[PDB]
Amino acid sequence: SMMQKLVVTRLSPNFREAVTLSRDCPVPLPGDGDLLVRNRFVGVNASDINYSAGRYDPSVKPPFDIGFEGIGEVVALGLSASARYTVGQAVAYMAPGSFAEYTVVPASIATPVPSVKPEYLTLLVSGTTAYISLKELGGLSEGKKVLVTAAAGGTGQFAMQLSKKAKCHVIGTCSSDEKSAFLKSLGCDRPINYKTEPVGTVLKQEYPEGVDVVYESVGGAMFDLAVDALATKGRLIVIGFISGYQTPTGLSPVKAGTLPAKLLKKSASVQGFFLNHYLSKYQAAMSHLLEMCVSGDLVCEVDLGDLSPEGRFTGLESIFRAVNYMYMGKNTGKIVVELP
Ligand SMILES: NC(=O)c1ccc[n+]([C@@H]2O[C@H](COP(=O)([O-])OP(=O)(O)OC[C@H]3O[C@@H](n4cnc5c(N)ncnc54)[C@H](OP(=O)(O)O)[C@@H]3O)[C@@H](O)[C@H]2O)c1
Ligand SMILES: COc1ccc(C(=O)c2c(-c3ccc(O)cc3)sc3cc(O)ccc23)cc1
């Protein structure tokens, strides 16, 4: 009848200062073509703070719902949606407003899943982003050298594994020896703990002819290093630049004044990627991702915060903790919050 949900009440990249937990909200009713989903797990994404900052559409004032992805049970649906879905059915989705106990989701974008497991949620945004970007833009093939930053993170774990399946030689950056071990377990050829080992030097010495593809999620100095490390005809894919998201503009400083010159000299490229521009590829990506997940051919690491200071991310209120956890760089795999 009523429920809790998170609401952006003030525009800001500081999640805590931007978002409020609202405690007596009416449970929304699904339309003819909608599902009403009781969320059991929701995804925490780096860009959640870009969203709370209002950067997706600056013409939109608070309050508005937040959260990009969820998985749970269909508890109610409109008549038309009932042709495909049924009450009690497990579904996952990528749609705004997942940070709530119940979310209305158009049946046409929902993804039927085998059951309500957090592993399936990792595929929705993090998995598809890696799958689609690398397939469409990566030009992957046997022997290509691929550099993945934030490699032990939500989407990084997939860029890593998929590149390995494409028979590429893969290098991955992360911030701890434990993260490096995780990378090794995913078949990383060259894990690099950037806190203990200078990435630029590793690249210059061990990969003198450069890397062919960069899956770049960090920005700033890491972006600078990756540009310098590009091989002839190399491709740097701008997936993100999380090092800048908390700043007032959300940007990270780069030493890019000489970027065009470097790109010309190497016939190399810098290519942006935004998941929402590739939705025509989404259903197929998710279909394949789900196969590998269920068959065990893809590790879908979940960080539910069980080893965080305050423990398992349970309840909407723990979303604040979980966001902070990401930005402290503590997570291995996808950050997920449970709503018991
Ligand atoms: N374009 C798209 O459609 C799309 C879709 C999904 C995600 N993304 C991007 O992919 C990247 C990762 O997002 P995610 O949600 O999956 O997060 P995530 O990788 O699971 O976690 C972020 C990781 O980045 C590193 N990091 C955190 N704060 C940092 C900081 N201030 N400076 C440098 N590094 C920091 C940490 O790993 P370390 O141990 O390596 O430092 C941290 O664990 C982000 O740029 C996100 O925006 C883009
Ligand atoms: C350019 O098109 C592709 C598509 C898939 C691949 C690839 O090798 C694989 C996958 C792939 C899918 C999407 C990507 O962006 C990269 C790799 S997944 C997978 C699973 C297996 O058991 C065996 C191989 C693969 C390589 C190039």
Curated annotation (Swiss-Prot):
Coiled coil: none annotated. It comes from the Eukaryota. SMART domains: PKS_ER. Transmembrane segments: none annotated. InterPro entries: ADH-like_C, ADH-like_N, GroES-like_sf, NAD(P)-bd_dom_sf, PKS_ER, Quin_OxRdtase/zeta-crystal_CS, Zn-ADH-like_protein. It is found in: Peroxisome. It is an enzyme of class 1 (oxidoreductase). Keywords: Acetylation, Lipid metabolism, NADP, Oxidoreductase, Peroxisome, Phosphoprotein. NADP(+) binds at T155, S175, K179, Y194, S217, I239, Y245, F273, F274, L275, N331. GO terms for molecular function: 15-oxoprostaglandin 13-oxidase [NAD(P)+] activity; zinc ion binding. This is Prostaglandin reductase 3.
